Amino acid sequence: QLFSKTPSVTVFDNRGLSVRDIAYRRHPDTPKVTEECITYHQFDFRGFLAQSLDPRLNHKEVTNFSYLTDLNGNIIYTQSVDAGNTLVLNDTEGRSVIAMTNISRNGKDDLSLAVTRTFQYENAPLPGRPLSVTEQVNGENARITEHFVYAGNTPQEKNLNLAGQCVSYYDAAGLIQTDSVSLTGKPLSVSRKLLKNLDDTNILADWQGNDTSAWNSLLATEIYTTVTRTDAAGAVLTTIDAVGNQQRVAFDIAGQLSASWLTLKGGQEQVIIKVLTYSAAGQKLREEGGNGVVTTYTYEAETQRLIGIKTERPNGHAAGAKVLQDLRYEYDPVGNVLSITNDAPENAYRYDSLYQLVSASGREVAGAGQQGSDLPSPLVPLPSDSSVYTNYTRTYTYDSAGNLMRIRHSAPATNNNYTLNITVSERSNRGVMSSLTENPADVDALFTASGSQKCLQQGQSLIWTPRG
Amino acid sequence: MAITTLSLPKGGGAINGMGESVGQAGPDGMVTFSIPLPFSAGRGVAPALSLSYSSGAGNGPFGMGWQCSAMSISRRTQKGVPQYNEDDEFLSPSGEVMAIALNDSGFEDVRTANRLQGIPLPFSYKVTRYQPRLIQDFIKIEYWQPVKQTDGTPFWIIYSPDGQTHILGKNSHSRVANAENPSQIASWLLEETVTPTGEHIYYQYSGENQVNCTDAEIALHPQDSAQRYLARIDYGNISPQASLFVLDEELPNLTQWLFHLVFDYGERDISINKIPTFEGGTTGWLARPDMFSRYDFGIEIRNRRLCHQVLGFHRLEALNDRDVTDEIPVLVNRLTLDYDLNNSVSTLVAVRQVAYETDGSPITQPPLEFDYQRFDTGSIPGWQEMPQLEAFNGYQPYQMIDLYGEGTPGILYQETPGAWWYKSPQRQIGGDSNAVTYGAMKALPKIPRLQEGATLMDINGDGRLDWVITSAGVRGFHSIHSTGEWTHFTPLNTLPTEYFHPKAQLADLVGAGLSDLVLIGPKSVRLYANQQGNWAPAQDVTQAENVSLPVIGIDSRQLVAFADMLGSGQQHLVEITADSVKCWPNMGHGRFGQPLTLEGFSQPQTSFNPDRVFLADIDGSGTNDIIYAHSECLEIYLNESGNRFSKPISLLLPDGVNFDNTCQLQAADIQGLGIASLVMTVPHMSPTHWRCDLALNKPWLLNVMNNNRGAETCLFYRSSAQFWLDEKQLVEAAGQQPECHLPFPMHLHWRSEIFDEITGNRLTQEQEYAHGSWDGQEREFRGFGRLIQRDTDGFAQVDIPTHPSRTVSWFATGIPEIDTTLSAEFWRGDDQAFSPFSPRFTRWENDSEAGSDVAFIPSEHDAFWLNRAMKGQLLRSELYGDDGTPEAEIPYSVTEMRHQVRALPTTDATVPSAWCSTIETRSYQYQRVAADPQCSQQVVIKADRYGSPLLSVAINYPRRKKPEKSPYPDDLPETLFDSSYDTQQQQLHLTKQQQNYFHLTNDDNWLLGLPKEQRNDGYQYDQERAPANGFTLETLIASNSLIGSNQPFTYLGQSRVAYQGGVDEQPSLQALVAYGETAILDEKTLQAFVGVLDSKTRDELLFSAGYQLAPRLFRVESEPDVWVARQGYSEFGDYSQFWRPLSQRSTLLTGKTTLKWDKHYCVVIETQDAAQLVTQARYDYRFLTPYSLTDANDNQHYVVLNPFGEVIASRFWGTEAGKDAGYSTPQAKPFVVPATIEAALALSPGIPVAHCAIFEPESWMQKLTQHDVSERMADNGTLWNALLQARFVTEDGYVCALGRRRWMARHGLSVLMLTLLAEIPRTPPHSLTITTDRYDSDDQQQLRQRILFSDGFGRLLQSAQRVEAGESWQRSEDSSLVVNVSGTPALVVTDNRWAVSGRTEYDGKGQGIRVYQPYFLDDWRYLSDDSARTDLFADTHIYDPLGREYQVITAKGYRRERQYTPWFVVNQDENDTAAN
């Protein structure tokens, strides 16, 4: 039991501020060696965060993070080599006036990708909610991403319980007409309009033009709706789904699900559940699926930890009587999984004191080869015999700052072996498969100002777009 | 803050009680307990009265030691009988001495005025602003006397700093005045108050009367007209008035006040099975067994009445504003005030909240119940020999006084010159700290001690003795300290009265502690002359020639004495025959009242030798009791309330002994117990002494507190003389010198236990104190030098090892000789901690610049008064917890304070007035490690003539040097102890905050110190900047202060408020806000924007965010403006609208909101927002609470409440897009909630309601009645009836909680009283509820069948929900688990299954240790603590002495562990902890 003397500790200034914190680390591969991992929180003249950093960049004596605020309150401006920068502002009421993102790491960071969001509002007498907000693209095609319609107090609205409601929200991909409500507060209905052709990537769902006399050019004919009724407790009593489906449900005295039925598109509604039953912990205990297969659940009564779950087919069933699974799990005192087994046989694990799962072992299928950007073939038919799967070891490696190094494996009887690197930045979390580059200085160019990645694969470019 | 919305109900809660707990320790040490009265606030203008008991109190209508006085202002007379002239003296309602003020021109506050609040008066008053000797807070006093006495009466006015303004004693009912010359007034009762809202409260009194008053009451106590009692209070005035209602030529009708408190002294039918009538009935107020009378003013008071019930009344159809005829307010609730009675005392047994159902049934809360340690005549012990003294009496061989001031006499045998030999009281070795003995004599240097009128008299009244010198021509004294310091001789400005003889030498009637001789008999009265140990001329007086004449010194079977049969404290003249007793009322200088006979005494005239009587009070009331000797027995006569006498107790003497003319009986506290024992010598044999410890405990101490919910207490109490004996024992163990000057055995709280009636756990708390303190000049108490507390729970459980509490503290006695020494008592394991604070003596100056104090050196007089002002200030305290570790000798923390005392000028040529100020504070957080505390200090710098906190500074000190080796355990990864550091720890920090105020402080406005402006800034510095002893005031004011004007800083904030009002957004008298204002953004903060924005984009974002620039506060010359927010835009009615809020708008950017009020301007009936969303409500004015609501969609919600105003059922219904939905309307489908859990379980679904709930606060008690038991015992129900007077069972048939003990135990009476209980188990106070998930139009309606349980206090104990049938554990009827043969919990199928939730077991501080897992049960009733402890799984939270978990254990031994240090905290998990 490795874990003896691996505590964590937090440290404070005379203002009681959380100046520093420590975690002890120890790989079971390194049982004689204990690492001390630490990071810092500098505080300002205001008694608030001045600086806090990546441990490894810090101990390499590089500074890479920033956080800046109003007179008290909250961050105005904030940067990392990972995140890029970020700026906002909001009202005295906290209503937002502006936000910006995807701004680079030089004198000043690059505002040309700021993807600016700004907001338009209810005015006197109305309470002051935003009636719209827009993507105010810097120096470019600024476009109104969304628009809110708030109802009045007509008797119609009152009956629909839509008084003051956001009875429309036009948005990216179109509009929700918040088009009726029950006195419980749950909807009586909503209508969704998708775009005039949701196929057409360049009808933008940006609400240029003054009203739907224009925006009809941007909303579908393929409009759909949901209609609903509910408990006084608000749980669903029934529902309708305009393509042709529909819903009904029933419950136990504590509100737990007993049974349910759903109308299939344009046709019958039929029962789902055959049995469903629960523990004193309220968690499931005894069930039977609509196909008639039977399940039960098992807990440590001292702790409610699930020790296992078991399932079988009944006598004379269409697929015949059979135990389908008997899941059993092995835990450390904290509860980390040490091993698992099932029958219808085993696997096992290792951890650092810091609970990095450093090793895993068990059965995996032969012949799939080294995992890449792919899904290999299923075995067909379903294997009647077990030797098609084989022993493996799988292992992993990590930084004292929050980064990984390599992944390392053998399935020896298959001869499938690898060790594979994520190249990671000399000065950030940015990192990629070795295939893209092996060089930790070069890797950080493979990312956007937000730090979104350029590519999936050697040429598989990632089309990042405004609003990230 | 935003709109006070019409509110959708939450629908539930937990069972209440009231005020359940007594406070922590205090330097008075006196037992006291108190709870506010449970009656409605009205519009927020309702009285603040409270029930209170104190061991320090006298007697009254509340019962003995109880107290619920209104506020009143009064004469001062503890020196003696007042003058009734110019020279009279007076006291504030808070109890403080009062004096004529000075104007700021240097002259007294004299003027005459012809208007009040500018309302013109019919005739002018001489008026004076009045000054207390010591300020608690700066309330303004004016006294009002007619310009000539024919022009009515004087009266009083008070002004609060919050402007609440009060008048006292304009009328006779509101005045207490001489029954035979009302030109003399003793006190002015609170009669009216006014608010700036023009709202009021009015207070109605009654005098005494002959209702239920007997012949003897008239004959002995005719002059009752001075007395007063509170008859009614009323409030909620329908018309606002900024001036007093007293200014009406007649007061408006009862109907003008919509809320009323009616006080009933047993008048209405005390039965609960009837709603009280608003009127009283033909009873009138009752009599009492135990009427007392007082003469504390040279005039009678006679005290005939006690309460029984108090009733709250709301004028319903006025409040509804629906009818005007016959405005009968309903009784909202009845307080019951239930008393124990005896012919000398009465006191509350109990109290209850009661309210009445629409069927007229009472409904009742479970009572709160009391008991008191009390006198007895049954239990008395047999007599005991006195080896210690056994022969040393009978003429010369006895001599005794408490020369040392032990609070206990020592036997100072003295025979000759020098024979002064003090056999002294000592603790016995071994046994309880109660056993005491006279140790051996000692010799000490002394006066030649003869030919001098020798006596160890304190002539001065110090409480500390002189010795009298009076030889031929030779006259003075010496003074002797407790040290035995016989001071040098004292000539006395000597003018004693000529000693013609001792015959009829008076002592008491000059005034307590002021005693002086008078030689007197018939038809004349010489005057006493003693002041303080000097004398006036011995003047001559007589009382009126009709007054019967008392005269000492005839042996004819008769006696006379100065001895208070009456127990006022004045040792009245009393004359005794063989057959009768007569006593003369004290009348002060030269005067007596006509004597009263006291009934009951007699003895056979054949044989009544007078000297066979003995004089002592025995009952402890003050009433002198009587003892008479038979040769075999004592006859003991006990004084009934100071009126007549009980049947005599006959007491058998020690066996074979006979009482005779040699025998000397006495009573004394040789026990040191604070209540005496009989002590006697029989100088016949060589042994002679005997005692009887008649009194086991001092009576009349409230010793048990209970509520029937399940709270109960054992309370414990101890003599100061006993504590001092312990102190003296230690003092001489140190060889130190006894100067614990406190010449009186006060008796004080010592220990208490609180026992949880339910779980059987309990809480132990105990206290001790040292250097009891006394004013040797003013003759008054001065506290203790040190206080100590300790505490643990006691546990039903070894799983909880206690680690017992300790804390110690020190307070100002105001006596340098003591106060200096306390410093030496301080813990000093650390020594880097800074040298202490000290009291700053300072004088206020109207300095002709802005006003300031100036620190100064008082004279010896001034210092005396100033220290007497610092009296009781907390100086220091020191916190500990005890365990197996060698750091229980180290504090967790220590705290210390600096005070400053402001002197103020006076018309008093002898002393100033004063105020005291807590100018500095500091603490060290040690975490029981002495080396490296965290340290912090907070200080004030600027304050005005009204002491407002204008400027403050606070400090957080840098860390000490890194330790030379780990003070912390070896278990730590060793690198930690080298790693746990930051430069930030070495960064010193200081904090600046500064503010100023308005003062509408003229005419009849007294609005002190209203908030005007505030700012914040901060400083940081290196450790090397630290001043030598840290900071003090003198450090912080300096030109080289680190926050002096030279020193730059980060600005951090400012705030302001604009008022709406008469000028310049300065406050109205109502000081309504126009808008709130705060700073938000600053030049340095802008540099965050600089990476993105520009001037225009910055400015437009700021303005669109609504901020503006404004002047920066406390800008001296050149500072930039700053961006501010402004908030809270709202509007209000006028005074005629009671200034009610009409609308609100958090900021102008938002949509507004609008409010609508009832005609009384009490209730917001209706509202709408500026999106025009309506909301509506309709209101139960019993509770000022909406029984209905309507939303903006016109969906209704409706709710119904019990007579106390508990929510008990609710429903909602409304509109549903071309349909109406929810339940039915209430009147469409009415319902009533069932009476019981089983009655509710009988219900079907389909009920037209969202919810209902049921409750049992009384569930803890069994309820027992004639029905069954009349079969079992058939004693014609005489028990069934009398168990109420036995208070075993209440009027509503519950087993009364103390009753259960009381009647079984008192004579071991019928075991039935226990046998018939447990068929109902004591059931935790609990509730059941249903809420329905679907409308009654659907036959599918799920019901949330849920129950919850709480302790005797309000702690949630556990809860359950009914669940679908299935396997469950099984409850036994006796609450046991059902179990298998192996004792396994009986896990079996049940239909009545529940899921059980939330159970835990708790510390008395509520900390849940064992938090249990969920489980099934077959029953709603409670499952036993014992079986739970036996079987049920829980994690166990493990708390430090601060109450922090340093560990938690899983239900299976693995742990989470945490350890705390001043600079860091360590954390460990179940795996790392498995190293254990």
Question: Which residues of A are less than 8 Å from B1245 in CB distance?
Answer: none
Contact A95 B1149 (CB under 8 A): yes
The token pair that represents B872 in the structure block:
């009781």
Contact A97 B984 (CB under 8 A): no
C-alpha span between A19 and B883 (Å, rounded): 32
Contact B1018 A47 (CB under 8 A): yes
Helices (H), B261-400: 316-319
C-alpha span between B1186 and B1167 (Å, rounded): 13
Specify whether the CB–CB gap between B1105 and A89 falls below 8 A. yes
- Rounded to a whole number of angstroms, the CA Rg of chain A reads 29
Residues 104-133 of A with CB under 8 A from B: 108-109, 111, 114, 121-122, 124-128
Phi, psi of A19, rounded to the nearest 5 degrees: -55, -40
CB atoms within 10 A of CB B1149: 19
Specify whether the CB–CB gap between A412 and A65 falls below 8 A. no
Cα–Cα nearest to B723, from B756, B746, B706:
B746
Contact A3 B1469 (CB under 8 A): yes
| DSSP 8-state assignment for residue B1030 | B
Provide the β-strand partners of residue B521: none
Cα–Cα nearest to B558, from B506, B614, B608:
B608
C-alpha span between A120 and A143 (Å, rounded): 13
C-alpha span between B868 and B860 (Å, rounded): 12
Question: Which residues of A are less than 8 Å from B1194 in CB distance?
Answer: 158
Contact B1217 A180 (CB under 8 A): yes
Specify whether the CB–CB gap between A223 and A196 falls below 8 A. no
C-alpha span between B605 and B241 (Å, rounded): 72
Contact A46 B1340 (CB under 8 A): no
Specify whether the CB–CB gap between B937 and B898 falls below 8 A. no
Contact A255 B1342 (CB under 8 A): yes
Mapped onto helix, strand or coil, the DSSP state of residue B1088 is helix
Q: For residue B1082, what is the nearest residue in chain A, using CA coordinates?
A: A71
Strands A35-43 and B613-614: unpaired
Q: For residue B959, what is the nearest residue in chain A, using CA coordinates?
A: A14
Question: Which residues of B are less than 8 Å from A353 in CB distance?
Answer: 1472
Specify whether the CB–CB gap between A285 and A279 falls below 8 A. yes
CA distance B874 to chain A (A): 26
Contact B1451 A302 (CB under 8 A): yes
How far from B190 is each of A339, B34, B226, B237, B301, CA to CA, in Å? 80, 22, 16, 17, 19
Residues 67-86 of A with CB under 8 A from B: 68-73, 76-77, 85
Contact A163 B1173 (CB under 8 A): yes
CA neighbours closer than 13 Å in the CB half-sphere of residue A156: 4
Contact A180 B1345 (CB under 8 A): no
Q: How far is CA B760 from the centre of its chain?
A: 28
When CB atoms are compared, the residue of A70, A232, A302 closest to B1081 is A70
Provide the β-strand partners of residue B988: B1021
C-alpha span between B1396 and B1360 (Å, rounded): 4
Cα dihedral sign, B1434-B1439-B1445-B1448: negative
When CB atoms are compared, the residue of B1020, B1085, B1332 closest to A70 is B1085
A3 touches chain B (CB under 8 A): yes
Contact B1192 A183 (CB under 8 A): no
C-alpha span between B1209 and B1247 (Å, rounded): 11
- Rounded to a whole number of angstroms, the CA Rg of chain B reads 37
Q: For residue A237, what is the nearest residue in chain B, using CA coordinates?
A: B1334
CA distance A50 to chain B (A): 12
Phi, psi of A36, rounded to the nearest 5 degrees: -105, 115
Give residue B396's region: left, alpha or beta (phi > 0; psi -120 to 50). alpha
C-alpha span between B661 and B612 (Å, rounded): 9
Mutate to test the interface with A, among B1370, B1472, B1476 (most CBs of A within 10 A): B1472
Q: For residue B1018, what is the nearest residue in chain A, using CA coordinates?
A: A45
| DSSP 8-state assignment for residue B1085 | G
Specify whether the CB–CB gap between B394 and B688 falls below 8 A. yes
C-alpha span between B936 and B895 (Å, rounded): 10
Question: Which residues of B are less than 8 Å from A43 in CB distance?
Answer: 984
Specify whether the CB–CB gap between A10 and A3 falls below 8 A. no
Contact A22 B936 (CB under 8 A): no
When CB atoms are compared, the residue of B1101, B1151, B1332 closest to A98 is B1101
Provide the β-strand partners of residue A281: none
Provide the β-strand partners of residue B930: none
CA neighbours closer than 13 Å in the CB half-sphere of residue A209: 15
C-alpha span between B1442 and B866 (Å, rounded): 37
DSSP notation for B971-1028: TS-THHHHH---HHHHEEEEEEEEEEEEEEEETTEEEEEEEEEEEEEEEEEEGGG--B
Contact B1333 A232 (CB under 8 A): yes
How far from B783 is each of A442, B28, B774, CA to CA, in Å? 79, 6, 7
Mutate to test the interface with B, among A9, A109, A304 (most CBs of B within 10 A): A9
Contact B1475 A3 (CB under 8 A): yes
Contact A20 B1366 (CB under 8 A): no
| DSSP 8-state assignment for residue A441 | T
Strands B1445-1449 and B1434-1439: antiparallel
Contact B987 A87 (CB under 8 A): no
Specify whether the CB–CB gap between A179 and A190 falls below 8 A. yes
CA distance A451 to chain B (A): 19
Specify whether the CB–CB gap between B688 and B390 falls below 8 A. yes
Q: For residue B1051, what is the nearest residue in chain A, using CA coordinates?
A: A71
C-alpha span between B1030 and B936 (Å, rounded): 10
Helices (H), A180-312: 212-215
Question: Which residues of A are less than 8 Å from B956 in CB distance?
Answer: 13-15
Q: How many CB pairs under 8 A join A and B?
A: 299
Q: With 0-12 CB in 10 A as exposed, 13-18 as middle and 19+ as buried, what is B299?
A: buried
| H/E element, B1100 | helix B1095-1104
| H/E element, B721 | helix B720-733
The token pair that represents B785 in the structure block:
């030098």
C-alpha span between B338 and B652 (Å, rounded): 38
Question: Which residues of B are less than 8 Å from A1 in CB distance?
Answer: 1471, 1474-1475
When CB atoms are compared, the residue of B982, B1332, B1333 closest to A13 is B982
The long-range contacts involving B792-796, CB below 8 angstroms and separated by at least 24 positions, are B792/B763, B792/B764, B793/B761, B793/B762, B793/B763, B793/B764, B793/B1403, B793/B1404, B794/B753, B794/B761, B794/B762, B794/B763, B794/B764, B795/B761, B796/B759, B796/B760, B796/B761, B796/B1425, B796/B1429
A15 touches chain B (CB under 8 A): yes
C-alpha span between B1213 and B1248 (Å, rounded): 10
The residue count of chain B comes to: 1476
Mapped onto helix, strand or coil, the DSSP state of residue B1134 is coil
How far from B620 is each of A112, A402, B641, B691, B1058, CA to CA, in Å? 93, 79, 11, 18, 62
DSSP notation for B1396-1425: EE--EEE-TT--EEEEEPPEEES-SS---H
Q: For residue A68, what is the nearest residue in chain B, using CA coordinates?
A: B1088
Mutate to test the interface with B, among A68, A89, A149 (most CBs of B within 10 A): A89
Cα–Cα nearest to A89, from B1097, B958, B752:
B1097
C-alpha span between A22 and A41 (Å, rounded): 12
Contact A36 B979 (CB under 8 A): yes
C-alpha span between B806 and B1443 (Å, rounded): 14
Cis link prior to B1226 (omega < 30° from 0)? no
Which experimental approach was used here?
cryo-EM
Specify whether the CB–CB gap between B1130 and B1144 falls below 8 A. yes
Contact B1192 A73 (CB under 8 A): no
Question: Which residues of B are less than 8 Å from A180 in CB distance?
Answer: 1217
A16 touches chain B (CB under 8 A): yes
CA distance B1041 to chain A (A): 19
Question: Which residues of A are less than 8 Å from B1474 in CB distance?
Answer: 1, 3-4, 333
The token pair that represents B1368 in the structure block:
């469950």
Q: For residue A280, what is the nearest residue in chain B, using CA coordinates?
A: B1415
Specify whether the CB–CB gap between A283 and A295 falls below 8 A. no
How far from B372 is each of B31, B232, B1036, B1285, B1353, CA to CA, in Å? 12, 30, 54, 17, 22
Provide the β-strand partners of residue B1252: B1209, B1330
How far from B539 is each of B508, B517, B544, CA to CA, in Å? 17, 12, 17
Mapped onto helix, strand or coil, the DSSP state of residue B964 is coil
CA neighbours closer than 13 Å in the CB half-sphere of residue B1148: 10
C-alpha span between B1315 and B385 (Å, rounded): 46
Specify whether the CB–CB gap between B1189 and B1196 falls below 8 A. yes
DSSP notation for B243-286: S-GGGSSSPPPGGGEEEEEEEESS-S---SSSPPPSS--TT-S-
Residue type, B153: T
A299 touches chain B (CB under 8 A): no
Residue type, B772: G
